Symmetry: C2
Subunit: 362 residues, 2 copies
């Protein structure tokens, strides 16, 4: 109810799931007396109400990004500026309520429901060369409270639940950038692999949002779900030749863009399917990331391959705008209490669900 009580209900210690080093789930410790951060100059402090799970959670913990010299070495994604320090609270897709504010900040902001932009840009221009993110370079949302810069706490003009709002920021920002890098236009066709996953699903929605035609490549039993989120046609990964199946599901239209989230043994086939002068784009490869590329296929077909992470401020604004105009919708695949993080991430890794899993403090 009251704003004053809220301001003074903020405890000195809190509950949080801590990442304590690289390795397996046992490296994630549920702790009961972690210092509540104090908002520095230009920061707010939010009471976390929801936080959405992403692949980067898992890969950062495993150290599964490899290095340029050794693709199987353990490393965080930030290969050249390691800002990961242990213990670290992970969690990128944070929603909460501002309960405290730091030095330069308007005290009128207290009480606001905010969606966190997880991005640390590290530049004033629109370059993505030095990016980092909350949950990697700085503590994230798998805790009861989180500090973050005021500019990053967005008030969204929407009637959605805190949980619903927590589904968007990492995967949909990443989705948008991919679609922007590939220059996907109204009326074009995008083939989306890993379509039932975080980014996959988002791209299907974001494709629709900009007037494009998505065709999902989905696991067995996930077809009807892909249709539900706006896919034009679905191709089941299991059986058949992919190229034939894509041909039939497309009804003949050539594939302008491939959005790949799987990679691995699928990669070469996607380059085969892609129309000449077509564009390939990726921000993750779950199957995975080291592929055999026949340069000749790339240049005889006049192809572009694009790799992309996260997104720009303008991309984020557009995402906020999409949420507000309801051009995309939240996909809640399940909800887990913070106290049951191990169960949450096990379920997360299995991927026997659609859309996104959300972690709530308790």
């Amino acid at each position: 109810q009251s704003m004053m009580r809220m301001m003074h209900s903020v405890p000195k210690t809190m509950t949080a799931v801590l990442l304590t080093g690289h390795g397996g789930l046992e490296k994630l410790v549920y702790s009961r007396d972690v210092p509540v951060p104090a908002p520095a100059a230009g920061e707010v402090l939010i009471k976390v109400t929801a936080c959405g799970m992403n692949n980067t959670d898992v890969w950062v913990r495993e150290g599964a990004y490899g290095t340029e010299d050794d693709p199987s070495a353990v490393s965080t994604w930030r290969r050249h500026g390691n800002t990961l320090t242990f213990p670290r609270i992970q969690g990128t897709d944070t929603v909460g309520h501002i309960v405290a504010v730091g030095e330069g900040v308007d005290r009128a902001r207290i009480g606001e429901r905010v969606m966190v932009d997880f991005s640390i840009y590290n530049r004033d221009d629109d370059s993505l060369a030095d990016i980092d993110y909350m949950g990697h370079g700085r503590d994230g949302g798998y805790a009861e409270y989180m500090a973050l810069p005021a500019e990053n706490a967005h008030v969204v003009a929407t009637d959605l639940t805190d949980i619903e709002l927590a589904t968007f920021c990492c995967a949909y920002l990443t989705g948008e950038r991919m679609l922007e890098r590939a220059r996907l236009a109204a009326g074009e066709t995008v083939l989306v692999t890993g379509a039932s996953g975080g980014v996959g699903s988002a791209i299907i929605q974001l494709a629709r949002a900009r007037g494009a035609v998505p065709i999902a490549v989905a696991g067995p039993g996930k077809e009807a779900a892909m249709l539900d989120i706006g896919a034009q046609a679905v191709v089941t990964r299991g059986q058949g030749d992919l190229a034939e199946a894509v041909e039939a599901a497309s009804g003949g239209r050539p594939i302008d863009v491939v959005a790949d989230l799987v990679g691995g043994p699928l990669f070469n086939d996607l380059l085969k399917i892609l129309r000449p002068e077509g564009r390939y784009t990726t921000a993750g490869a779950i199957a995975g990331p080291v592929v055999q590329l026949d340069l000749r296929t790339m240049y005889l077909k006049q192809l572009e391959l694009h790799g992309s992470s996260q997104g720009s401020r303008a991309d984020f604004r557009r995402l906020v705008r999409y949420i507000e105009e309801k051009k995309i919708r939240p996909l809640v695949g399940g909800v887990y209490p913070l106290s049951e993080f191990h169960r949450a991430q096990t379920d997360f890794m299995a991927k026997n669900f659609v859309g996104k899993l959300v972690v709530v403090p308790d």
Copy 2:
């Protein structure tokens, strides 16, 4: 005199024939090849020079492979085989119009022309259905060649016939690479296989456009690279490349990599490229099949572009570059058509700089 000229054009000629896929025994020097009659909209030229390109060798070998098998025997056009044997190869053709076909001005006879090897196959500027002369159609390794009239360009230059046979395939390819990588004035390009055709072309073309080229080349080729406009030269076989390039540039970042080598250099090239950088290729002489770490591409926000040949607009610009003397010919050797096996043996070993030229006789 005028009548004499209508009938003085021989009915047979000599030409090097590609008879099938294989080694050099597939190139038969033949003295009795029918001289093509020019069809509607065509000219017939007396070839005086023709430049050598990697495609000659690769089409001969069928070393393009297939989508399903990277090492199957295959010509470059994997989805429309217009290569029929015997074929006369040779892309970079210069000559003199001796005859004109059905809808074409008689006045053109006597003109000195540079052949545009491109078969566009579309009205628009899409390269999706391209072919070339010397592959889809007979090329310039012959005394005479027929071609569409509009692909026969009178260039406004005092350049020698041999000099002019330096440009069209490698420089069109290079232009497109730069176009596809969006290389802007002030930006730095790292060019590998820099002493070869496309390599050298890109060095010149980057300067033509205000960019700063850094050459990666063979041992003892530093001086030749500087002479054709390279800012700095890195010598390929002496130390870590990233460190060498580091030292070679001002420490300044690499915006674009133009790669014609691939193979063992590929992953290294991706390391060196600045985040948000652009990689562009049209051939990989040291190995076209490479292991790519998608993580490197996506964490670094990279683009990779594959490109081949170029557009009509790209070609017009090339002519302009030649006329305005913004680029110059790099003749590395001239060879007679009768000694083709020697010419290609030299061509394949790359112990030269610039382009190799085959003159009939």
